[PDB]
PDB file of C-alpha atoms and ligand atoms in Angstrom:
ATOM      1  CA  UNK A   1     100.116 116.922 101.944  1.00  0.00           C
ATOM      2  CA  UNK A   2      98.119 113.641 101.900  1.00  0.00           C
ATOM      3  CA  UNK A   3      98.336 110.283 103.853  1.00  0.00           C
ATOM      4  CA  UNK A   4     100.740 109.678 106.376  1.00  0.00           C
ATOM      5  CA  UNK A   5     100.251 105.737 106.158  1.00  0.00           C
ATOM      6  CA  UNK A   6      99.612 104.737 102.456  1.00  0.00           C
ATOM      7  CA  UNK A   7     100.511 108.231 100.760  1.00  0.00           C
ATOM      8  CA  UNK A   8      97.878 108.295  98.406  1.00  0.00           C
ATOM      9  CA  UNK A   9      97.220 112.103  98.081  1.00  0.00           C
ATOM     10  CA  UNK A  10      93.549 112.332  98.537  1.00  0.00           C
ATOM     11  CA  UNK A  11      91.845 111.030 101.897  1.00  0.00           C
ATOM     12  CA  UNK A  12      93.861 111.972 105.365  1.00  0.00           C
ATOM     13  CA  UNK A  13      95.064 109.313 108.201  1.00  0.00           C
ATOM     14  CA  UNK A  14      91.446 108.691 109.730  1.00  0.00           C
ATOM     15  CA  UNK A  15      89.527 107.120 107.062  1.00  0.00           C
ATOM     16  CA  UNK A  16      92.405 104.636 105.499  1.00  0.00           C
ATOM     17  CA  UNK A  17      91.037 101.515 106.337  1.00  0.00           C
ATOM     18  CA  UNK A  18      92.118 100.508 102.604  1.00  0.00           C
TER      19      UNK A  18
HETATM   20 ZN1  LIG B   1      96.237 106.448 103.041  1.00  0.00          ZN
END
């Protein structure tokens, strides 16, 4: 489980304004 939108596996799909 990670990000739905980038995939990094660390922060969720609320805080990836990166
Ligand atoms: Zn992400």
């Amino acid at each position: 489980k990670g990000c739905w939108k980038c995939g990094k596996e660390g922060h969720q799909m609320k805080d990836c304004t990166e």
